[PDB]
Amino acid sequence: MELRVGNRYRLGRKIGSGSFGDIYLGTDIAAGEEVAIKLECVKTKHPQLHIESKIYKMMQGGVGIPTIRWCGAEGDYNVMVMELLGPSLEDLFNFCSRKFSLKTVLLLADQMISRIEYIHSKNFIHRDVKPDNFLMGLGKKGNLVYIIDFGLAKKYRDARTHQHIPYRENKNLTGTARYASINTHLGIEQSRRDDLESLGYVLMYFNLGSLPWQGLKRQKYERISEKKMSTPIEVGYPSEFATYLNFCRSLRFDDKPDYSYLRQLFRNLFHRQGFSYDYVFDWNM
Numbered sequence: 266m267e268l269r270v271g272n273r274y275r276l277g278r279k280i281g282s283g284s285f286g287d288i289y290l291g292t293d294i295a296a297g298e299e300v301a302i303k304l305e306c307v308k309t310k311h312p313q314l315h316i317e318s319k320i321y322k323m324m325q326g327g328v329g330i331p332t333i334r335w336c337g338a339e340g341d342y343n344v345m346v347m348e349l350l351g352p353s354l355e356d357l358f359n360f361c362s363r364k365f366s367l368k369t370v371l372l373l374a375d376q377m378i379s380r381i382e383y384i385h386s387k388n389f390i391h392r393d394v395k396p397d398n399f400l401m402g403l404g405k406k407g408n409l410v411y412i413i414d415f416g417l418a419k420k421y422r423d424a425r426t427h428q429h430i431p432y433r434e435n436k437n438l439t440g441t442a443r444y445a446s447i448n449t450h451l452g453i454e455q456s457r458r459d460d461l462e463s464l465g466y467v468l469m470y471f472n473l474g475s476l477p478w479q480g481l482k483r484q485k486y487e488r489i490s491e492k493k494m495s496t497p498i499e500v501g502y503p504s505e506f507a508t509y510l511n512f513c514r515s516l517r518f519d520d521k522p523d524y525s526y527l528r529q530l531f532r533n534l535f536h537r538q539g540f541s542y543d544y545v546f547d548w549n550m
């Protein structure tokens with residue numbers, strides 16, 4: 266009676282949209298676990314689902330990479346089924362009345378840097394770094410930060426040679442303007458530096474509750490750009506956070522980030538503030 270995709274996954278209601286297409290809840294009846302289901306019309310002009318499924322598979326087994334359960338076709342749609350994950354950092358931030366404590370911001374930072382370094386180690390750049398695209402795990406994996414939504418992800422080097430993409434200009438802002446790097450706002454081809462810089466804005470977003478460039482009425486994107494460029498990093502939180510954003514801006518187009526330095530930057534603060542390494546988040550307490 267009930268709809269089951271490939272007779273395997275009881276269909277649930279809609280959760281959201283991703284870089285492309287709609288996402289749905291489902292239940293894996295045989296495995297007994299909840300799942301997420303993405304559909305793309307096979308009739309679509311520029312198919313995007315196959316590239317993302319190809320990227321997930323190469324990363325499969327990496328810490329915080331969702332596991333693919335099925336990728337088939339049903340009706341007019343292509344389908345990919347992943348294990349269901351928990352709430353996004355955006356949903357946890359709103360759930361906490363838009364207030365995260367420094368300890369939690371720092372605990373998130375350690376994994377978020379680690380997730381981007383992993384992505385980069387596999388020759389892709391994410392290009393859509395925002396709180397919505399980090400999800401906590403379910404159950405015993407609820408302490409693990411996951412990265413999702415590789416639909417705007419791009420290869421930044423070649424697997425064999427490790428030779429970087431070319432400098433390019435006049436490229437529309439891919440991803441979300443609020444967390445976009447200044448280079449991204451300028452139309453510069455995005456590279457590895459831009460994923461970590463966007464994260465730097467994510468950390469200040471968690472600290473501030475909003476960003477200095479968020480309230481504003483092609484022009485809206487222009488307004489966001491001008492406010493960020495016109496806003497000094499120093500324009501009330503521990504200095505380690507400001508050192509991070511300035512470092513990312515100084516990176517060259519092709520430069521490999523010093524990921525270990527950045528993690529150790531926040532951990533030294535984590536230690537000096539004397540927070541416990543118990544991995545208890547604001548929503549745990």
Ligand SMILES: Cn1cc(-c2ccnc3[nH]ccc23)c(-c2ccc(F)cn2)n1
Binds near residue numbers: 300303
């Ligand atoms: C934006 N977005 C959020 C999710 C999502 C939500 C909850 N749990 C999840 N577990 C794995 C992904 C995911 C997805 C998604 C879902 C399935 C898929 F094949 C591709 N992307 N997109």
